[PDB]
Design an enzyme around this catalytic site. Structure first.
Site, PDB file in Angstrom:
ATOM      1  N   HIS B 348     -10.453  -7.720  13.523  1.00  0.00           N
ATOM      2  CA  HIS B 348     -10.020  -7.270  12.198  1.00  0.00           C
ATOM      3  C   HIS B 348      -8.589  -7.695  11.883  1.00  0.00           C
ATOM      4  O   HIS B 348      -8.030  -7.292  10.857  1.00  0.00           O
ATOM      5  CB  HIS B 348     -10.092  -5.747  12.116  1.00  0.00           C
ATOM      6  CG  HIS B 348     -11.427  -5.180  12.480  1.00  0.00           C
ATOM      7  ND1 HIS B 348     -12.367  -4.825  11.537  1.00  0.00           N
ATOM      8  CD2 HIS B 348     -11.971  -4.883  13.684  1.00  0.00           C
ATOM      9  CE1 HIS B 348     -13.436  -4.343  12.144  1.00  0.00           C
ATOM     10  NE2 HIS B 348     -13.223  -4.370  13.448  1.00  0.00           N
ATOM     11  N   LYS B 539      -4.295   1.291  -1.191  1.00  0.00           N
ATOM     12  CA  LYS B 539      -4.472   0.743   0.155  1.00  0.00           C
ATOM     13  C   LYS B 539      -3.209   1.054   0.942  1.00  0.00           C
ATOM     14  O   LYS B 539      -2.189   1.430   0.351  1.00  0.00           O
ATOM     15  CB  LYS B 539      -4.693  -0.767   0.128  1.00  0.00           C
ATOM     16  CG  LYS B 539      -3.623  -1.550  -0.623  1.00  0.00           C
ATOM     17  CD  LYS B 539      -4.036  -3.004  -0.780  1.00  0.00           C
ATOM     18  CE  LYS B 539      -5.113  -3.166  -1.846  1.00  0.00           C
ATOM     19  NZ  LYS B 539      -6.305  -3.907  -1.354  1.00  0.00           N
ATOM     20  N   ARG B 540      -3.262   0.899   2.262  1.00  0.00           N
ATOM     21  CA  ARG B 540      -2.072   1.115   3.082  1.00  0.00           C
ATOM     22  C   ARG B 540      -0.951   0.176   2.636  1.00  0.00           C
ATOM     23  O   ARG B 540      -1.212  -0.955   2.215  1.00  0.00           O
ATOM     24  CB  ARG B 540      -2.376   0.913   4.571  1.00  0.00           C
ATOM     25  CG  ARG B 540      -3.233   2.012   5.177  1.00  0.00           C
ATOM     26  CD  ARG B 540      -2.497   3.344   5.251  1.00  0.00           C
ATOM     27  NE  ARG B 540      -1.428   3.320   6.248  1.00  0.00           N
ATOM     28  CZ  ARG B 540      -1.489   3.868   7.459  1.00  0.00           C
ATOM     29  NH1 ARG B 540      -2.571   4.520   7.867  1.00  0.00           N
ATOM     30  NH2 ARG B 540      -0.447   3.767   8.275  1.00  0.00           N
ATOM     31  N   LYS B 545       0.039  -7.142   1.771  1.00  0.00           N
ATOM     32  CA  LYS B 545      -0.777  -6.696   0.636  1.00  0.00           C
ATOM     33  C   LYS B 545      -0.020  -6.847  -0.697  1.00  0.00           C
ATOM     34  O   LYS B 545      -0.623  -6.781  -1.771  1.00  0.00           O
ATOM     35  CB  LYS B 545      -1.233  -5.248   0.845  1.00  0.00           C
ATOM     36  CG  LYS B 545      -2.232  -5.073   1.984  1.00  0.00           C
ATOM     37  CD  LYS B 545      -2.246  -3.638   2.489  1.00  0.00           C
ATOM     38  CE  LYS B 545      -3.155  -3.426   3.694  1.00  0.00           C
ATOM     39  NZ  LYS B 545      -4.602  -3.543   3.348  1.00  0.00           N
ATOM     40  N   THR B 647     -12.079  -4.018   1.943  1.00  0.00           N
ATOM     41  CA  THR B 647     -13.301  -3.273   1.615  1.00  0.00           C
ATOM     42  C   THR B 647     -13.156  -2.454   0.346  1.00  0.00           C
ATOM     43  O   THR B 647     -14.139  -2.227  -0.367  1.00  0.00           O
ATOM     44  CB  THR B 647     -13.726  -2.349   2.759  1.00  0.00           C
ATOM     45  OG1 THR B 647     -12.640  -1.485   3.109  1.00  0.00           O
ATOM     46  CG2 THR B 647     -14.140  -3.173   3.961  1.00  0.00           C
ATOM     47  N   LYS B 651     -15.515  -1.583  -3.282  1.00  0.00           N
ATOM     48  CA  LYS B 651     -15.715  -0.265  -3.885  1.00  0.00           C
ATOM     49  C   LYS B 651     -15.513  -0.342  -5.383  1.00  0.00           C
ATOM     50  O   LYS B 651     -16.336   0.166  -6.150  1.00  0.00           O
ATOM     51  CB  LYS B 651     -14.786   0.783  -3.269  1.00  0.00           C
ATOM     52  CG  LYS B 651     -15.033   0.987  -1.772  1.00  0.00           C
ATOM     53  CD  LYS B 651     -13.925   1.818  -1.145  1.00  0.00           C
ATOM     54  CE  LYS B 651     -14.018   1.771   0.373  1.00  0.00           C
ATOM     55  NZ  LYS B 651     -12.862   2.374   1.019  1.00  0.00           N
TER      56      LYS B 651
HETATM   57  C1  LIG Z   1      -1.276  -1.341  16.046  1.00  0.00           C
HETATM   58  C2  LIG Z   1      -2.696  -1.756  16.460  1.00  0.00           C
HETATM   59  C3  LIG Z   1      -3.160  -0.944  17.668  1.00  0.00           C
HETATM   60  C4  LIG Z   1      -3.541  -1.616  15.349  1.00  0.00           C
HETATM   61  C5  LIG Z   1      -4.162  -0.412  14.988  1.00  0.00           C
HETATM   62  C6  LIG Z   1      -4.974  -0.366  13.853  1.00  0.00           C
HETATM   63  C7  LIG Z   1      -5.178  -1.506  13.071  1.00  0.00           C
HETATM   64  C8  LIG Z   1      -5.980  -1.451  11.930  1.00  0.00           C
HETATM   65  C9  LIG Z   1      -6.583  -2.726  11.310  1.00  0.00           C
HETATM   66  C10 LIG Z   1      -7.436  -2.672  10.034  1.00  0.00           C
HETATM   67  O1  LIG Z   1      -7.656  -1.617   9.440  1.00  0.00           O
HETATM   68  N1  LIG Z   1      -7.904  -3.864   9.643  1.00  0.00           N
HETATM   69  C11 LIG Z   1      -8.744  -4.023   8.446  1.00  0.00           C
HETATM   70  O2  LIG Z   1     -10.147  -3.990   8.830  1.00  0.00           O
HETATM   71  C12 LIG Z   1     -10.977  -3.995   7.658  1.00  0.00           C
HETATM   72  C13 LIG Z   1     -12.434  -3.893   8.085  1.00  0.00           C
HETATM   73  O3  LIG Z   1     -12.703  -5.033   8.926  1.00  0.00           O
HETATM   74  C14 LIG Z   1     -10.717  -5.261   6.781  1.00  0.00           C
HETATM   75  O4  LIG Z   1     -11.396  -5.123   5.533  1.00  0.00           O
HETATM   76  C15 LIG Z   1      -9.225  -5.429   6.476  1.00  0.00           C
HETATM   77  O5  LIG Z   1      -8.999  -6.674   5.798  1.00  0.00           O
HETATM   78  C16 LIG Z   1      -8.430  -5.357   7.784  1.00  0.00           C
HETATM   79  O6  LIG Z   1      -7.020  -5.450   7.532  1.00  0.00           O
HETATM   80  C17 LIG Z   1      -4.541  -2.690  13.433  1.00  0.00           C
HETATM   81  C18 LIG Z   1      -3.734  -2.744  14.558  1.00  0.00           C
END
Ligand SMILES: CC(C)c1ccc(/C=C/C(=O)N[C@@H]2O[C@H](CO)[C@@H](O)[C@H](O)[C@H]2O)cc1
Ligand SMILES: CC(C)c1ccc(/C=C/C(=O)N[C@@H]2O[C@H](CO)[C@@H](O)[C@H](O)[C@H]2O)cc1
EC number: 2.4.1.1
Lengths: 807, 807
Positions: B348, B539-540, B545, B647, B651
């Site tokens: 991701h 979004k975050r 972004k 995502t 929506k």
């Molecule tokens: C700091 C590390 C441990 C970490 C923790 C959480 C994340 C979270 C990543 C995330 O939410 N990625 C998103 O996943 C979605 C579903 O695949 C995608 O739609 C989105 O583009 C992507 O940024 C990233 C790194």
């Protein structure tokens, strides 16, 4: 099966069965093929609890309509034990549930054994609180128990190599079906901060806030459809780098984490003080909220009684003042009047090292405003002392709430006497000792405050519940009414010469012993002779209770058998059980001594099955319910003047054991009620102990004159009971010879001779059982119903009531 | 009221009403006169939950009989939101409960608002997991979600002075009726210790034990009577001076205390690593236990699929090896074969600072045996690389699991590729980028492993639940089947010229906006023009972004209005919402910027109601359910190549908003499905961004050529938006001019010009709505049902199934 357990109607059994299966399915999310016995217990528990709630809701409704005076029992300890069987008994559901569970192919007694003890107490004081709640509900008083919901109660004791090991009592692991969380009634409690003075009075500011979340537990009366509440507080952090901040919430919530297991020695631990204010602060807001929704606080004492269970919630006094003065703006003298009229204090503590004396520096930091209020209370109190005893400067320093010295301390007992309209001891001899010695000055100032309220136990838990056999055969002769009016037991006197009753009483004891002897083998792999005399001492381990004296007798019996192996002696199983406070070294040594004696005596082939010494592991309420009915001899052998009352003593008397004991605590009243000839009294009286102190207690004197005693000390010193570690018991011998506050040797001779007379009576079963009937028949006074009725009439100013609420 | 919410039969409404009143009485211990709305919610919640359990029990029974291949979805994040309405929708109980609650004189929608969000995730990755569980249940797969039961989910965001404040999400305070604790399935997890080598292999010894207690939450499929399980682990200390020992239990239990709120930047925190092993260790024992009770681990991959949601549970790979090698005694090569065939990995993450690279010294201390296994995996892997690319020493160091440097690190992404039979990206463009750049070496070695699985969302939560109005008018034309087969929406194309449909689609949007505009005033005291274009970015908050790009446009619109005040412009309400990670300074500055812009723009009388800038506080799932249906314009404006998929974009498309965005992530596939003319595309493509990097990105160039941009920077620098603190936004200007990784200025011109064309279309409502229909009609591909069906067929080797289980 037996008639005291209630009716098992077709309608009720049918209803319990579908509600059982409903809870198994919907509440537990199981089916019959995967359910464990634990799941079955929970389904039964939830089923029985459904019968309480209707009664619980209309009982509280009833108190709102009628608005009677409310009794608030504040304690840091509630030793409740198991709730399932008690609830069934009090609602008359015991046979129906037994029939219902039997028809589903389950054994109810096996499911009862799965319920965890609610061990939120240490011993006598905590268990008295539980008996009181039961009795208060049974007598229709609008009464609330207030305390702390500890996550960890009294530790589970495990013996390892004869040494006590403590592990945590994680009693909530599997959930508690009896409690209802009430997060909507959450209240702030304040700590630290400082005091600001203004034109509009004092103000407590810059405080840390901890939230108090209440959990309500129902307390059912005996077949009166009254269901009172026990409200226990739980600590919660408020919701206002990031990771650590969230993890640090634990510090606030630690307040309700664990019960202090120390019941002998006071320690000025900050966390313990937080616990004490926490319970007091949240409870008093709850009391006031309920009073206000019934501005005129003149009526507060006519609608509220606050009972202090020892000094542990003593801060209720200055907290009530704080609220009344700082927040409600009453003048000092009027607030003080309301406070005294509201509060009452019960003392449970004789020994000076057990008294609460909080360092001033602690109160300064944690509760600065309460310190000021205490100083002001002291000053106004000592002015009255000066005015009544002019010139007596000695009296002033003795009676002061502030004790001076290297570190200043607040004496919480003195605070309680000053701010309560009544102070009571828990047995007649104890209440006299309070007037003659430790609170003599206070008695001379305010003689009207000092009362006696001799303790009692609940006959529901301590007869009907734990001893259905005995309860039934009594019911056959005199009927059921004795269960909530224990004086009726006197009618058993006219059966002392009845041959069938004598046979039945003796048979119930023999059944109870057989059942308990089988419990020992299955759960602990130890065999015992069920035809031996069951000699039992169970209670917390303290030097003053003199488990060592018992040990000396045990070793004497062993040595006499080894000396004349082929002479007949009455066989005995000697059982000693109880927990030692974690930091109490001598108590830990005594437990080790008892197991060491067992290691020698239980494996000597010359002895056979004529003497056995067993240490009862993890003594707690549910174990007391099993061992007490099986006992023949109750050991209540504290040095005269040290055991305020005792309550175990009463449990044994009610369940058909004879008592060997000193004239201490409630023993005096027990012998008086049964007659001294039906009681194995021995040893020094209070006056004899005082005579010995003046002369000076020299233990060597007894060692020099008594050869049997000399031999025992030499066996201890030289390693007879610890071959691998010859000097293991040097501290014990050294304490017994040079530093014995409790004079074990001074009672040895009378004790050993009195024990011979017990054995002699046990050789004549008929006469043993007739003496037993005379004890059981005179145990009525020691019902907690009588106790509470006296508190009600003579302290709280409310009339009891046996009348039913509508079902 | 509306037909998609199901039947409200007389029998069902009657039954729900008595079960409601039963739970209020027995379960909550209340009556109608004291019950709060919270009590009413809980009674409804418990009532709805009773309908699940029968289905839950027979679903698990069904999987035992038939023994299908099991799918295990391992994630550290499950962003579930509220459960009540979702459960009602999926069981067809929504109208009945609405009718039932109405007849008791309650408003159901008011009770739904009382339920806490289960915010056990940060954003996209966590919410994808939730959509996947719903879709997996709906397609009849035997699928289990495994994760951690955090006591505190994502923090509640509060704005104070325009600054984000974090407070703890105490979501379990009032209890969770949806979960069932299963203390009987508790499992040990090991930490620390050391490795002992023997003749019979390696042994992990001297470990600290933490207990993992599972809580099961039901996951209902859409009207198929399938109810799957989500199992979340909770940390418990084992039960083996005294006070402190008991208080120190907290350290072990801290493992499941709080969700790490950092989704941008990797930090090698020990506690986070413990969380990752904890979930993996307990889950794999559970998987194996279930497999063994169906010694031949050849069949393990035919009965088990383990899906890794990013690298967060990467340790599943070496843990599976450890168990198979050390405990089950399989030879290395056979264990490795089973592991690869079992595991699959979804990426991701594009940005390098977000990749997990654990310091070796950490793994050494905490998981010594797993370090050894990783070293051995690396060595055997690099031997295959050497053999396929002989001489290429550069390839060896690049492909190694061990990254060398000052501090050695394990690259968990490289571990995952090596030990999985499949690796997938989450959008076609993202999956190509993985093959072309960051995992190019791995793609050249094993081209067969790399797949694409374009993301999706669940149309149950994201259409039927949050937008009943829109779901209903669609159902009137084409029927109900589209809800579990979203491709059917294409049939709406033949209504693009229908006058009544155009009117109804436009009316639903207008109702949704009116409802949301009233939510803003009541809960947050802000008024907005409901006839303005609702321009939404939620979004975050991350630089990639490009919330800043939005801010630049907003300031441009403001400056043009101030320049020619009396010219007509399309009114807009611009809404920006989202959380910033606690330690991310730039993200916190951007939130402050947005509120600062609001402070100027919302209080300028020349502007009127033609421009409003609102920051949406505490963005979370339940807020997304309200704001998304009300949106006209969806802002998806990430620098090309940075947003793996997105995502939220899907929506908005499904709920009747038009999209302004770059050719990034799933946007590319969205424009492709709807046609590029029905989509507001702008800015650099991936190739353009790469061309700019080679030349070197000079921001000053854009500042020099674009006067409107120069003016905005000068306003920021000189304090136009922060009069009291003139240099407040110096870091922002400085980053934009010298240190912008994401090239905000490079897209400014195309963005602003594309935004004008949006306004032009919005001036012609009919043509706006026709374009909307073309989007909604082509959103079918972006159902998570399609996504899961592709995972099932192409990765897990199981066939989906829409067929009902018996009710
Ligand atoms: C700091 C590390 C441990 C970490 C923790 C959480 C994340 C979270 C990543 C995330 O939410 N990625 C998103 O996943 C979605 C579903 O695949 C995608 O739609 C989105 O583009 C992507 O940024 C990233 C790194
Ligand atoms: C260390 C201090 C805070 C402390 C904590 C608990 C205790 C517990 C005292 C206790 O249990 N006392 C017993 O009360 C019973 C009921 O009144 C009496 O029967 C018994 O004789 C008395 O020792 C004492 C001191």
């Amino acid at each position: 099966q037996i008639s005291v357990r209630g009716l098992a109607g077709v309608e009720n059994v049918t209803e319990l069965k579908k509600n059982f299966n409903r809870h198994l399915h919907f509440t537990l999310v199981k089916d019959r093929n995967v359910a464990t016995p634990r799941d079955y217990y929970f389904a039964l528990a939830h089923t029985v609890r459904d019968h309480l709630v209707g009664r619980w809701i209309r009982t509280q409704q009833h108190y709102y309509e009628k608005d009677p005076k409310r009794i608030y029992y504040l304690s840091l300890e509630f030793y409740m034990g198991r709730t399932l069987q008690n609830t069934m008994v009090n609602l008359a559901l015991e046979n129906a549930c037994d029939e219902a569970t039997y028809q589903l192919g389950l054994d109810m007694e096996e499911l009862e054994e799965i319920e965890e003890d609610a061990g939120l107490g240490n011993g006598g004081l905590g268990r008295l609180a539980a008996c009181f709640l039961d009795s208060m509900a049974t007598l229709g008083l609008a009464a609330y128990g207030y305390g702390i919901r500890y996550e960890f109660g009294i530790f589970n004791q495990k013996i390892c190599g004869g040494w006590q090991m403590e592990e945590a009592d994680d009693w909530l692991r599997y959930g508690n079906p009896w409690e209802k969380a009430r997060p909507e009634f959450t209240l702030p409690v304040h700590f630290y901060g400082r005091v600001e003075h203004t034109s509009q009075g004092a103000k407590w500011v810059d405080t840390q806030v901890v939230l108090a979340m209440p959990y309500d537990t129902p307390v059912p009366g005996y077949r009166n459809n009254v269901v009172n509440t026990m409200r226990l507080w739980s600590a919660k952090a408020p919701n206002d780098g990031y990771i650590q901040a969230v993890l640090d919430r634990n510090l606030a919530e630690n307040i309700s984490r664990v019960l202090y297991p120390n019941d002998n020695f006071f320690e000025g631990k900050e966390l313990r003080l937080k616990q004490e204010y926490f319970v007091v602060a949240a409870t008093l807001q709850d009391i006031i909220r309920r009073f206000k929704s019934s501005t005129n606080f003149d009526a507060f004492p006519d609608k509220v009684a606050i009972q202090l269970n020892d000094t542990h919630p003593s801060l209720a006094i200055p907290e009530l003042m704080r609220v009344l003065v700082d927040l409600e703006r009453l003048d000092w003298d009027k607030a003080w009047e309301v406070t005294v009229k509201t509060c009452a204090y019960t003392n449970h503590t004789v020994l000076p090292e057990a008294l609460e004396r909080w360092p001033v520096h602690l109160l300064e930091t944690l509760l600065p405003r309460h310190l000021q209020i205490i100083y002001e209370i002291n000053q106004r109190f000592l002015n009255r002392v000066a005015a009544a005893f002019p010139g007596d400067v000695d009296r002033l320093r003795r009676m002061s709430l502030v004790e001076e010295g290297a570190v200043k301390r607040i004496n919480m007992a003195h605070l309680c006497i000053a701010g309560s309209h009544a102070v009571n001891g828990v047995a007649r001899i104890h209440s006299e000792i309070l007037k003659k010695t430790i609170f003599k000055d206070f008695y001379e100032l305010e003689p009207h405050k000092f009362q006696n309220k001799t303790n009692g136990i609940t006959p529901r838990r301590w007869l009907v519940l734990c001893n259905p056999g005995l309860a039934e055969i009594i019911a056959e002769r005199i009927g059921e009414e004795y269960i909530s009016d224990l004086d009726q037991l006197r009618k058993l006197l006219s059966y002392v010469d009845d041959e069938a009753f004598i046979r039945d009483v003796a048979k119930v004891k023999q059944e109870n012993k057989l059942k308990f002897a089988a419990y020992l083998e299955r759960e602990y792999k130890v065999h015992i002779n069920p035809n031996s005399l069951f000699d039992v001492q169970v209670k917390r381990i303290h030097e003053y209770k003199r488990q060592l004296l018992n040990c000396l007798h045990v070793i004497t019996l062993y040595n006499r058998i080894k000396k004349e192996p082929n002479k007949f002696v009455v066989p005995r199983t000697v059982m000693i059980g109880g927990k030692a406070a974690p930091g109490y070294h001598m108590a830990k040594m005594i437990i080790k001594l008892i197991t060491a004696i067992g290691d020698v005596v239980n494996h000597d082939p010359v002895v056979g099955d004529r003497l056995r010494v067993i240490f009862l592991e993890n003594y707690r309420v549910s174990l007391a319910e099993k061992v007490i009915p099986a006992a023949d001899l109750s050991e209540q052998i504290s040095t005269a003047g040290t055991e305020a009352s005792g309550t175990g003593n009463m449990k044994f008397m009610l369940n058909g054991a004879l008592t060997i004991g000193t004239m201490d605590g409630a023993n005096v009243e027990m012998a008086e009620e049964a007659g001294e000839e039906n009681f194995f009294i021995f040893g020094m009286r209070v006056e004899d102990v005082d005579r010995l102190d003046q002369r000076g207690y020299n233990a060597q004197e007894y060692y020099d004159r008594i050869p049997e005693l000399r031999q025992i000390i030499e066996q201890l010193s030289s390693g007879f009971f610890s071959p691998k570690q010859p000097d293991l018991f040097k501290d014990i011998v050294n304490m017994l010879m040079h530093h014995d506050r409790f004079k074990v040797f001074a009672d040895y001779e009378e004790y050993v001779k009195c024990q011979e007379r017990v054995s002699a009576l046990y050789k004549n079963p008929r006469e043993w059982t007739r003496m037993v009937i005379r004890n059981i028949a005179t145990s009525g006074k020691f019902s907690s119903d009588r106790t509470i009725a006296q508190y009600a009439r003579e302290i709280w100013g409310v009339e009891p009531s046996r009348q039913r609420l509508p079902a």
